[PDB]
Design a protein around this ligand. Structure first.
Ligand code: DSH
Ligand code: DSH
Ligand code: DSH
Ligand code: DSH
Lengths: 343, 342, 340, 341
């Protein structure tokens, strides 16, 4: 299948085991911004669901499918590849919706549906949107979508902005400098200090922050889920050009994302921006190996290149320069192993 | 190999990727109780190492191999399966010990050593001692040990005692109450209420506690690494009989372990007991799904059974019974995925 | 009448309870109750001076004495319990035999010599409606002249959603006893559900800090001057709260105010948590499962009171968060409350 | 039968009270009760091995399960309240439907179809006799085979004179609320006497230090194997205390024991103040007037318990100092005890 060809089995096993836990479903369902906005988006656009045929990709506990039922859907095909599919069936039975909701255990790339659907629903967004690469399953499912069909969410926006955070940057060296000592119980560790620094800088930092650390207006990269193909996400190039609001040192790029549910009645936004209430996605920061100095008005230009890997994630390559000085910097990060720094 | 048969590849990949990170090594090294005690055990028993052949199973950054070098060992074969082997070699070079420490990348079950060894060193202890199932790799390595040889650590003591902690119990039972909701956004979740409770109570709790929650003297189970076979650890059965000292509710069993480095000069103990300084192993508590009552003087008997699984961990089944009243409690736990409460 | 709306068993224990002097002392030591009652009557002594009074449930007779102090020419004090004997004793020792006339028996049965200008009583129980004495209080209007008055004149019931994690776990903990799979070797888990219901059928009587209230209270008024006896067999109270803070709603809090709409001034007797504590305290009904609501949401539903023959009420509460559809329903027995 | 000696009003409230699971819970949490009962049965398994058992007032059915553990063949479990319903469930879930047979109704009204080898029950109330369930227990002996046994087998009530100046003063401090001339302009004085009498008619349910007891206890035994239910309608307990310490006696302290005389051993369930506290506590009845006694004097008199239609007893106590001739008495309503703990 398409899934098995882009995923190393070792990764797939752990991925679906992780989602078999009810504790994980609970944690996600307890994010009201997530749960609430989806319900609102579906219910306030009931004309997109009323007596329609619905596909739920990675339904988990099946919460989204129930929302589709509340909106008046005729039939909902809820697909789940983990063992959470068992528990989903239980809830459909106990909620007496066995006649409208059909739980299909398996991967959406492998199962077969009896008919085309009017709309696909899913919550495939990971850290800075693309983590988990589930967006590709979401786009793959479009093979079951009528040419008239819609998708919730309809679009995805990733936001990039440069930040200054001296404490975050110094932290990496404070920790790595553990290795910079000549006699740890008689052992000179200093030779591994360089390797420790690199390791720490390869980790995207997941937490939140005061919006005042952002030094320029954000750049936006949009994915239209109605137009995009699976292969469009294997390699995501995000050029950027930041016009600096304040003079100072830039220690890296901060990331967040929005998704919009563009229904017939109204558009509903789900935002994980630092200006909005915190969500379980938090925000993501990628440090530069060397800070770049830029005075206000200067231009910080470069490329953020996301390369998909077999571990259901992305290799992040960032290159940036100050146009006026030629001062340059880069970094390579592994989005699969982020550092969770939130209190 | 022996390793690949007992281990799901998925678990192995994740396992050795975890230990490939320097940050993990730093964390273990900063446990000064661990590092200081290991160094003490080796150096104060330096006669066991001087001019001897040493095998370091899972050397990681190679710290123990450096201790064995400090003690006068002539040759140290340091086996490491993760990519940390490359970092070890770097440290060996930069510490000018190339003539004495030989890094051998690979699994101990798969590599071939040039000669038999006088002593095997390693730190195969995980949560509850047995997690990670690395004691088996430790024992497997005995195929390279001379008959006169020794092993550091030499033995492992598992301690278990009944505890009372209403707060912890409510805490875990409370998280399962989420799945009692009859209308979460209009959806009835209560059908999954039972499975939720099971899932949360299958989690061993890793943290520390005041020793006054323990309601009886600990029971001890000893594993002799010199005499034990690999297969002996596939199924570990620990019967217990506690004589209750105080009256009240027993919410579960508390676990910790000691290991002894039985050297020629001196025996050195590394203890993770709640009476001892805290280590990165902490202690482990398995909760009963329902607490049992017992008066002081009563007898609490049962068995703790550890079933090895292919995810490099154990399936824990605990049956407890108040002999005087017949009050019974049974619970299963997945040692692989515990709840870190600290 | 009273006999048909009341099981004999309940009536016996009921009037036996009010035959004890220790209970009268307990009620009289409530200086909020006694003081406010005395003020309401004396401040509006024009409604009593040289008037005909009916004391429905005089007990020790304290209210009738207040009516006497106000200047009432004749006071008919009706009491069903044996406390009627004690009242007569006090009437004689206070030299008021020409003013206060004790009449043993139930108000629904006794015959009075003349119509009265005003009826006085204190029929308010927990949540105001407990004891179902308001009905007897209304029934007594048959002796009330047109243009007459009633003390209390009206009754306000207040409802508000609260948050109290501790209280919720307290009642859940008690129900967790029947989860034991081997209590002395016996499996009790089969009755876990029945236990949960039972404990959550109990209204909680106690006081609390007003900061637990997550919205402004709803008001439900019962005008005793216009209310018919039949109106209190079934009482439906619609409520629509606008949540002020975000968090878990563990239930609804209950208290009541009664007003003495007198000639000179209206006097209020409040059991609100903002007001000094009374022997009525407040009453809280717990949801079997709390509902989550964010500030700005609306909590809608209906509190339904259905009178039973045990001189109490069967309280059905249904509540929902209109924005999310989060719903909760619980039935409570007002007869057996839990005092903590 | 039950209907003849019980007012309907009392019967309603009595069985409603026991229809609550919260009530069964509180009793099962008394380890002394549950423990001793389980201890008594299992340690005398010879009296239960493959036998037929009758459980009078099984409640939640806890006792029936204990008999089952001992290897009983059949157990007839009778329950008049709605708790019988929940008992049905626990029998089903514990897979003992083929051994335990629940019967809804009064033991003196239900129709039993077989004779039994032993009768089990918990009839003890405050002062043992309260609730008068001890008569249903004896009534059930009509289903008992001769030579059969009973658990409990005997019941002991213990009487001792106590001195408690604080407890005696409390009654007046409370009643003296009425002794004021202007409570909000009202003279309550005339009811003070009535208030005093009312308080003194209430037996006090709580615990106390053994040091207040001024003489070794007297004991009155009820042999449940050798007694008819009529024997309990009127219980006369003559007493004669030889005073240890010199002082004032404010009343009599009550507590009880029951024994399970099995083939293997006898097991005692004690509610004495010397033993760990139970949900029965102890009971004290005040004299209207304290009696002064010298160390050596003898406090004689009788404690007369008269069964009433309210499933309880009217308590008449008369006592005198023989050396002085000073006498005091009191009359108490055991249905309305004052819980002071
Ligand atoms: N809030 C961020 C987390 C979103 S919940 C992701 C859900 O989609 C399922 N899932 C993932 N890939 C899938 C696939 N190819 N087919 C079916 N289900 C899949 C996965 O098992 C989980 O239940
Ligand atoms: N708290 C105690 C932590 C234990 S450190 C475990 C160390 O031994 C390595 N290791 C594990 N199993 C191994 C095997 N079979 N062969 C070689 N190296 C192995 C693993 O990669 C890591 O470096
Ligand atoms: N704080 C709570 C207020 C209780 S004081 C109400 C008094 O009125 C009596 N009473 C009750 N129902 C009655 C009736 N139908 N007729 C006459 N007296 C009655 C009752 O016995 C008591 O003495
Ligand atoms: N401290 C120990 C308290 C004793 S528990 C009293 C139990 O005996 C039942 N019971 C009482 N009288 C009964 C009768 N005549 N018939 C059947 N069940 C009866 C009553 O319903 C309750 O379950």
């Amino acid at each position: 299948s398409v899934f098995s060809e882009r995923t190393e089995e070792s990764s797939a096993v752990q991925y679906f085991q992780f989602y078999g836990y009810l504790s994980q479903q609970q944690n996600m369902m307890q994010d009201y911004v997530r749960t609430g906005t989806y319900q609102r988006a579906i219910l306030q656009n009931h004309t997109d669901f009323k007596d329609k045929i619905v596909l739920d990709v990675g339904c988990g506990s099946g919460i989204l499918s129930f929302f589709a039922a509340q909106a008046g859907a005729r039939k909902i095909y809820a697909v789940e590849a983990s063992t959470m599919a068992q528990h989903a069936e239980v809830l459909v039975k106990s909620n007496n919706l066995t006649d409208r909701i059909v739980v299909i255990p398996g991967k959406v790339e492998e199962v077969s549906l009896p008919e085309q659907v009017d709309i696909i629903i899913s919550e495939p967004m990971g850290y800075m949107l693309f983590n988990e690469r589930m967006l590709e399953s979401y786009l793959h499912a479009k093979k079951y979508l009528k040419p008239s069909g819609n998708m919730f969410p309809t679009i995805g926006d990733v936001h990039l902005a440069p930040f200054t955070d001296e404490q975050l940057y110094m932290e990496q060296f404070t920790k790595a400098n553990f290795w910079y000592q000549p006699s740890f119980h008689g052992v000179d560790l200093s030779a591994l200090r360089g390797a420790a620094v690199d390791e720490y800088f390869r980790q995207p930092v997941v937490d939140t922050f005061d919006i005042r650390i952002l030094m320029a207006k954000s750049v936006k990269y949009t994915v239209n889920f109605l137009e995009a193909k699976e292969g469009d996400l294997h390699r995501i190039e995000i050029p950027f050009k930041f016009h600096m609001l304040h003079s100072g040192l830039v220690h890296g790029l901060a990331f967040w994302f929005d998704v919009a549910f563009i229904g017939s009645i109204m558009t509903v936004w789900l935002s994980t921006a630092p200006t909005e209430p915190l969500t379980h996605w938090y925000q993501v920061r990628c440090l530069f190996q060397s800070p770049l100095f830029a005075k206000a008005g200067d231009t910080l230009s470069g490329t953020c290149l996301l390369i998909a890997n077999k571990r259901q994630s992305y290799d992040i390559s960032i290159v940036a320069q100050v146009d006026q000085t030629g001062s340059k910097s880069s970094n390579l990060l592994d989005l699969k192993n982020p550092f969770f720094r939130y209190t």
